Point group: D2
Chain length 424, copies 4
């Protein structure tokens, strides 16, 4: 069996509670997290965190997405920072245990329409192969259309995360979310544009709506602010990070903490440590029930397979859900149901591998073996690659159950199969 020790870890006594109040009462500081940290960390790369050596430490500490703030620096300065990130990421390619994709995100300076500087910076993003754009001061759907148009003929695959920073963005949230790939709760400007005491309402509302829509949401700004000068955060800062994860944020961010502060690596380590504790404290019993009840009926096989796979994973306490994905969409649809099981996404797309860091609980594995002549063999090889990577990384052991999600034919858009495999 699994043993009594298994059921005492990862807040499992609080997970089995019949009410949210009982769940809180059962949270235990001695119940150690076991699962891999699922909330991605976005770290802003600037003066304090640009060197290849420092970037290697940031990657080891847990950085998944490197943010470049185009309100500062120049194209040349940010191109060097991007090259340093890619050099630091590729320095781990000689070890499957440490190699991890890192997304590159361009955060625009901001705005009548798109500013001339934003057009040029978005063009720089396309030319430098950025994965994500954090679009500043998105106030309406037409702002997203303008950013999308500026990403032009080569950059349509770039994810647009709309930053909600003012009253209009909050009021027109639904129309903005509908055309965006995701949202950033940009609390710095939001806290100056609307009363500071109302920011938590906008944050909780936007995270809730993104969770309902199945689109990534980032919580940003001043999460560990005091760590710009101090080696340890305040009690409010650790609480803020934990509560952003409990609210439902897919990603958490560091700005000045990593861009210009004295402890960039420590700030990343702190977000990693808190997120892991907070993820185990999520009350999945209610969350899954509510996500299922609110999500409409669907005839899309990927969506149908995803909910079946997440339900199967909860039934057996599956160590992982291994999914084959070319665009990341099948992994994103699993992530929207918030499984406790890690979603190991095996993909040949380096871009999709970097971009799926936007979805909570997705662990991308970039697959580079040449395609097998028999498609069923190529699928089996990728599933075994996910399993062997999971064993090497500590997600899986022999005797564990894993859920495996695939499609009936090659190419994106055909996911329709869920299998239950015993790890051998």
């Amino acid at each position: 069996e699994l043993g009594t020790a298994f059921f005492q870890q990862q807040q499992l006594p609080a997970a089995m509670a019949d009410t949210f109040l009982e769940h809180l009462c059962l949270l235990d500081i001695d119940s150690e997290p076991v699962a891999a940290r699922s909330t991605s960390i976005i770290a802003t790369i600037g003066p304090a965190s640009r060197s290849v050596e420092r970037l290697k430490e940031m990657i080891k500490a847990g950085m998944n997405i490197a943010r470049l703030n185009f309100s500062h620096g120049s194209h040349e300065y940010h191109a060097e920072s991007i090259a340093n990130v890619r050099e630091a990421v590729e320095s781990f390619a000689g070890s499957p245990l440490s190699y991890r994709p890192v997304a590159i995100a361009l955060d625009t300076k901001g705005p009548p329409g798109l500013s001339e500087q934003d057009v040029r910076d978005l063009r720089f993003g396309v030319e430098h192969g950025v994965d994500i754009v954090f679009a500043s001061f998105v106030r309406k759907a037409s702002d997203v259309a303008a950013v999308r148009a500026a990403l032009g003929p080569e950059g349509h695959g770039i994810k647009i995360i709309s930053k909600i920073e003012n009253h209009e963005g909050v009021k027109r949230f639904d129309e903005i979310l509908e055309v965006s790939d995701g949202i950033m709760v940009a609390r710095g400007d939001l806290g100056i544009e609307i009363p500071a005491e109302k920011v938590f309402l906008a944050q909780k509302m936007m995270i809730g709506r993104c969770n309902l829509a199945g689109k990534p949401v980032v919580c940003a700004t001043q999460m560990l602010e005091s760590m710009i000068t101090k080696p340890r955060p305040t009690r409010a800062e650790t609480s803020d990070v934990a509560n952003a994860v409990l609210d439902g944020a897919d990603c958490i961010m560091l700005s000045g903490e990593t861009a210009k502060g004295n402890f960039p690596v420590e700030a990343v380590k702190m977000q990693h440590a808190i997120a892991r504790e907070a993820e185990a404290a999520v009350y999945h019993r209610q969350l899954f029930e509510e996500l299922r009840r609110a999500a409409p009926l669907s005839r899309d096989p990927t969506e149908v397979t995803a909910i079946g796979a997440v339900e199967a994973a909860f039934k057996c306490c599956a160590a992982a859900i291994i999914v084959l994905t070319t665009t990341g969409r099948s992994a994103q649809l699993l992530s929207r149901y918030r499984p406790r099981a890690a979603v190991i996404a095996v993909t040949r797309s380096a871009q999709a591998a970097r971009q799926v860091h936007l979805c909570r609980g997705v662990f991308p594995l970039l697959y580079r073996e040449p395609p097998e002549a028999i498609w069923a063999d190529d699928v089996d090889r990728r599933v075994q690659f996910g399993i062997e990577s999971g064993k090497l990384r500590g997600f899986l052991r022999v005797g564990d159950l894993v859920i495996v999600v695939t499609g009936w034919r090659p190419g994106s858009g055909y996911t329709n199969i869920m299998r239950v495999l015993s790890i051998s």
Copy 2:
């Protein structure tokens, strides 16, 4: 379409509370799904004719009960032969062939403390004549079930033992009896004389709830349509009793004198069919599925894990059916325990398993007769296609419907581990 969402009590199904679900039940919302609660009809003088048996099979009889409290072995052997002749008369059309189980209902212990000598002889007769199920009378403890099992011998290991709970001791030792039985029958005739009549509904509801929780079949029996022994139409209490047995969670409903000796055996079957179909649509699946999942323990059995994933997937897309390949019936039983609204179409080569799965609510057995294809994946596909073609012919499926297909990774029982979303073409 909007027409789809007005049928099968779908407005009541979408209600946020059980009270609002009741308020939204509509007599004009027609049932669409195939009737999922199996009908057990007792064989007797009113229903022994081969031609009458053909009408009973067409009316909806799924299990033929042989009551060994009446008649000799020669009588029951002729009943079995007539049942098999009527059932096999439809085998020439494999896409519409309906398996029918044969169940032997024992006389019981009488004044004795356990298995009677007549029950030993009757059980051996059952094994020799290939009966599918034993309804063991007056089961009072786990050792009664062990004695029935021992009396079936080495050749009767595959026969299902449904323990009849008929007295206070059987109700009190219910958990130990259920643990060793394949299922239970709430034998209300004797139960209503052994305990106060006004307490039988408590024992019925409790046993049905516990069987639903255990994922084991439960039968509601006796006097369900009693007045139809002599009258062409049942009383208001009888139609209510049948509907409430289905709403309670009974996998099967039974007819005794109504089919064994009455003047309306076919009409009694038709009446149970009509009521069960209306009552199944009136089940509040939102609460039932939530409570079955919450109560069902965590499992590391891949068949069980695939079954809950498949049922969840079926609810997500309003799947017309879950097509499952099964050797023993177990993969279909594990789907049935989650009470999907989608029909569980069970494709099997085992004639016995096809008959026995009628014990599980919502399982529609299809007996596949073709010998195995040389390539196993082709053999699996042909059986899934047989499930689809049978489903289209019977009205379960249409082009454009979504179905969930449940199969395993290798031949042989015990390896179900795959769930697939398929569009019917």
Copy 3:
């Protein structure tokens, strides 16, 4: 376990094993069913009223006394049979049997008199025979009219008009007997005092296999509206000739109570059968078992969630009183009422505690039998000089009568519901009292 541990130590484990209390404490409806226990004996007084049809087999004063003792709360007179003279004599016999127990509130049981109309026959509305029978009802002081074949709101307006100025206090229970009555249910319920699910005609007018849907829907809507609903016809049919009912019949009675019926009815079983008293005893025995098996935890939660917010102090006090009663496992809720309305508003929340309704109105005492769990106590003392003393005396009468009848025991907690000024409509006070 922790939510009941202190009360389990105080009241004892025997208390918590009775009246399906282990099933009552279950967290899900499925667990509640699994915990139903045939050895868990009912303790509470039977709350679902029994309507018995009085006819040839049950007309004698001697037999009527046995029927009252067996549990009959409402006597039904079926104007499809007999005559005005025949029914007047049955009514006089019922009143003689009822008044034979009038020497004390411990023995007195008010029994309502209900007139069930012949109906419109082939006509579009109120027939001439119904006009005459309704006038007979008013002249003979009937408490309730079971109006046959109500198909729309104008049918109940016609019955109301035929009762005249003297019959304004008579309750109109609309019988839903056909497809149109089911389809126009909401408009009919709005203008009626309650509904009868008249399954005999309903089962011939619509497919027999659909009657249970109409029954469950109408009971649910009446429970939501807080108006009485009667389940009727063939509940114990075989008892017309047999001393024991079938398994389907006992199931039907239990399920009508579990569905939420305020009343259950006997027709031929008491009007013409060989076992009228035994049929009443059987409905009494089944209804007490089924009432204990109600899953109050979900029922109360759903009645709260569905019932709209209210600014009516009687309604606000009623929900507070029912909540208080559940918190302490109160033996009873004693309520002072002039029209029965304050007791009806307590009854709509389905407390497990008996609602002891103290009233000076003999008619309201008979009519409140339509509401589940209301036990009417007719108070006959003239008003005290000080109104607050008169209120206190009526509460003490409820307490003393309750103790002498086993509803209350010394040490029990009782919830008392009263108002701030005389007259109907001013209930606004809830008090928790310890019985000494």
Copy 4:
């Protein structure tokens, strides 16, 4: 609608979050009490008047600093500032005085025995007992308060691993708990403090005992006029977690913006209280609160249920010790619990319970006890109207007892205002 009522009507917690609206203005009075530490930056009578107007309900004196003479002068200044508003009885706001002990350091220390004696002699209402790690620590504090300090509330500060592990035994003998996050965040891993906070708040809510969230809630406001985004989030989340009180330490004791820090906690708490998902919270609290034969417990749940049914503007309760108001507060009604008491100490102490608004009764007594009760209820109504809690046409729930003295609450009445 106002006070997040569209989010309040949601059928799931997820839909409730989706319906939260920054334009839905709070209307209800701020329920979560603010504890402000009184020190060098907030000692003056003039500053204390501004702190009281800003929303300070409890003045904390940190006995780790200053001296008996320094703290006695702070206490006198607090009382002078509080009493400067007593000329208006319908609007008078009581303010509790809480003594926070220095702690055991390396049983009960000799400095704590002297400071606790000082507390009793100066009539403090509450003791925040530092580093409580077991039930015997609470017994020692109680013994040190002596026979004259029987009425002082002991709020045990949970500051280390042992206090968290022995939480149940500590809560059982304490009047309430303080999640003292400063030391807790150094004694256990910083990333685990939120788990201890949420667990302790949940258990206190279940026990119906006050819980205080403390330390670094608005830390940056010691030097900056506006807090960080994490600080406003922390305050809001402490309220959403279920904290009865929120605290300011350095922000008011030594910072440059003590009044602004109080105003910020007030503004956030009011917004967060309206964002509480009462539908789930009430259902869970009501389900978990044990069955009881105590008439005050029975009346309290009946009154809270009645208040929710009619959207009551307030529950007016007469209380001698504060207990009847505390039992109403444990069910977290949206309706303000207006507690009318003659006890000045109970009026100050009842600030520990969320949503209890104490009114100190100083009107002449009525000869007949029933008449006296009616005028205390009319006092609650008149004070409620003046303060904006009540308007003509509102419904209120009134909770009283059957005889004088504490422990006899057993009546709930539905009253229409004016």
